[PDB]
Amino acid sequence: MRVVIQRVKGAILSVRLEIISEIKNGLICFLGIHKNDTWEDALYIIRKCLNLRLWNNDNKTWDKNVKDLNYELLIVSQFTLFGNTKKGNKPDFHLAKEPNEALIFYNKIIDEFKKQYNDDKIKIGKFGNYMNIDVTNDGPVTIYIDTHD
Amino acid sequence: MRVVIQRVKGAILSVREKELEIISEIKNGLICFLGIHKNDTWEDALYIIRKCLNLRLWNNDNKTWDKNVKDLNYELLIVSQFTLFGNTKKGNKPDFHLAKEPNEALIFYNKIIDEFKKQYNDDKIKIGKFGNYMNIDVTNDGPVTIYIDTHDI
DSSP states (O other), X not given: OEEEEEEEEXXXXXXXXXXXXXXXXXXXXXXXXXXXXXXXXXHHHHHHHHHOOOEEETTEEEEEOTTTTTOEEEEEEOGGGGOBOSSSSSOBOTTBOOHHHHHHHHHHHHHHHHHHSOXXXXXXXXXXXXXXXXXXXXXXXXXXXXXXX | OEEEEEEEEEEEEEEOOOSOEEEEEEXXXXXXXXXXXXXXXXXXXXXXXXXXXXXXXXXETTEEEEEOTTTTTOEEEEEEOGGGGOBOSSOSSOBOTTBOOHHHHHHHXXXXXXHHHHTSOTTSEEEOOSSSOEEEEEEEXXXXXXXXXXXXX
């Protein structure tokens, strides 16, 4: 899996526009699922989203994680991350896991986010639908992880 | 050189005695979080500018992934993000050692912002305060996120 993590003072997620998700402080995570991802790839991403110290605490920097501060996470499935753009200007999403197997895997990723942190702290979107997300980028702080490293 | 490109309806950048001021605003376009590696050559910058300016990340009436930023007459907001070279292999605390030392990073970033203006419309590129802490409200349009590391290419 690939993931883009941004630190936010809040995010509102709307669909065709109907609001359907909100978070106050915390993390928006754009999670791409690769065609050959093992439940291991999931784990590494979950375990990194939840434990990464991305907030300052008094006079320390990079000290506190999203759990520590009782913050929330908005998880959005983002296949366009496997958009190879190395050859020509038309992104090529061949590496990206197919929408159906994707949805089931992504769901298991949400279950686990809940098991590890908290049922009420994991917010999602509507998988495979056009979404509008207002994101209050705090910093901003963007973290990239490709779990093939 | 690394960039995260998220497609947007608009984005409003603000800096910080106490609370915020909007210094940058774009409507329909791209926001580009641009991290600069310590060993980045100008050719790494060129690929970044090119792809940002040329990738077809917009559907076009009946056709998908077809129109780029300039075709639609759109804007860019170019924000330096060293955190992109945050190394999260080690532990839970990220070390950015691979990022470019902020004094020369700033030199490079402006050269880039020029080249951005040069290679498109110069009045179509907005930025943020290099050094500083920022607040960016972003209407993500999809969302559509695109990652590029020039060191792959």
